[model samples]
Target: SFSGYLKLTDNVYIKNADIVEEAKKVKPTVVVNAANVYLKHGGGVAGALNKATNNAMQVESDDYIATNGPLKVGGSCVLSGHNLAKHCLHVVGPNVNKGEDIQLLKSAYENFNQHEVLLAPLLSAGIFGADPIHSLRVCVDTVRTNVYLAVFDKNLYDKLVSSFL
Candidate 1:
């Protein structure tokens, strides 16, 4: 169930819902993966995705780098396979041990070719230790086309929803 909405643009929105549900609604051209610098779909949102795709998401991720090379915090890799979106735009976020420049996240979204209805999570707020509002603001600023931000946490969702309202 969706809790509320945060409208970034006429078409861009943030909603409190499961990412899978939001993905179904938007049918996004790209879904941002809260990946690690190494592209390991291990924990947090990545772990949820791993379960969603039957552990094949990691396999698909490896295939992605085979052509695109390694990904950094602000870098991106496209992923495609059954049970995934048309493409998965992988973005590594900052964690407790490492700090990431938000500019990289901005660059990742700005540099990506496809922008029609992209879906993303709160980039560094999960397992990664960055602030949620700051992460969301960066994503809102960088995205040029229709995008949906799907948030699952109740407190995080409320904070974003309140800020927008």
Candidate 2:
């Protein structure tokens, strides 16, 4: 399964993030699936490289990525493959715009906050990768107006959908 592109200085596997966060992690004795694992291009590119599935933004379903039409549009993560995360990595920066001297927003905000189960995480983390209504307006001002201020305000899009179904 775990196809191509190894060389992150080798040394394959080594677990222990609290035993993979207390699940007593096991099973994965050999479940390596890869089709597109482009961590930073040092490994070509991917989307459906060989395939085993499960990547496209964690695949809860509802696949939507065409940012705009006419082949392109405004600055909202820059259309098309806009850092495609679905199906595992399909990005295409090529050094954006040639403007702000290309800092690319704090290394895409510390690589999407260290790639925390990434899916619009910090709207794909700052330096202007921001979209999806500015990442729902910074997740409604950082988790409902700065950490739930006393039952929070701004009607949280109508009281958080009545505490969710």
Candidate 3:
């Protein structure tokens, strides 16, 4: 309900929005969903997105892994959206405490940047254990396309908004 805003760059923007709902309204854009290496779709953003399609996402995710093996850390693959958006980009975030976590995170975002319009949840933090502030900064530094960050968490919204002050 608290939609925050920030102009990180000309192309990259951050706002508090339910990415699942927002993606449907936007239409044709790809939404980035958080995922584990196994492409399991449950919990947080993954769960929400999976539910939006009536659990179809988890099925497609299973097929994806079965067809071509599980995703590597810092990697992603696109799966057709049942209705959330035109496509869903699923990424496996590397553990923050691990070496080169920032670079790996950046690499995942770099793949995300390949799209024209992207709606992304605040990924790699919380469940994945990324340092919140640093992860956002890395995104701010790296994103160079028309990407709308959908931050669902209130605390992160507050912190990101305060960073502008």
TM-scores for all candidates: the values are 0.82, 0.22, 0.88
For candidate 3, lDDT tens digit of each residue in 1-165? 213446777776788777787777776558888887888877878988899889999998898889999888888898987787878888777766454355688877777777877888656876777876776777777777777888778778778867742
The window of 10 residues in a row where model 1 has the poorest summed lDDT is 104-113
Candidate 3 or 2, higher TM-score? 3
Indicate which candidate wins on lDDT.
3
RMSD in angstroms, all models?
A: 3.0, 17.0, 2.9
lDDT of 1: 0.70
Indicate which candidate wins on TM-score. Answer: 3
Question: Candidate 3 — worst ten consecutive residues by lDDT sum?
Answer: 1-10
Q: Residues 90-143, candidate 2: write the lDDT tens digits.
A: 222212332332233333223222222222212221222333233333334332
The backbone clash count of each candidate, in order, is: 0, 5, 0
lDDT: the better of candidates 1 and 2? 1
Q: What is the number of residue pairs that collide in model 1?
A: 0
Instruction: Report, for every candidate in turn, its global Cα lDDT versus the true structure.
Output: 0.70, 0.23, 0.77
* Candidate 3 accuracy as lDDT: 0.77
In Å, residue 99's CA in model 2 sits off its true spot by 8.9
Q: Rank the candidates by TM-score, best first.
A: 3, 1, 2
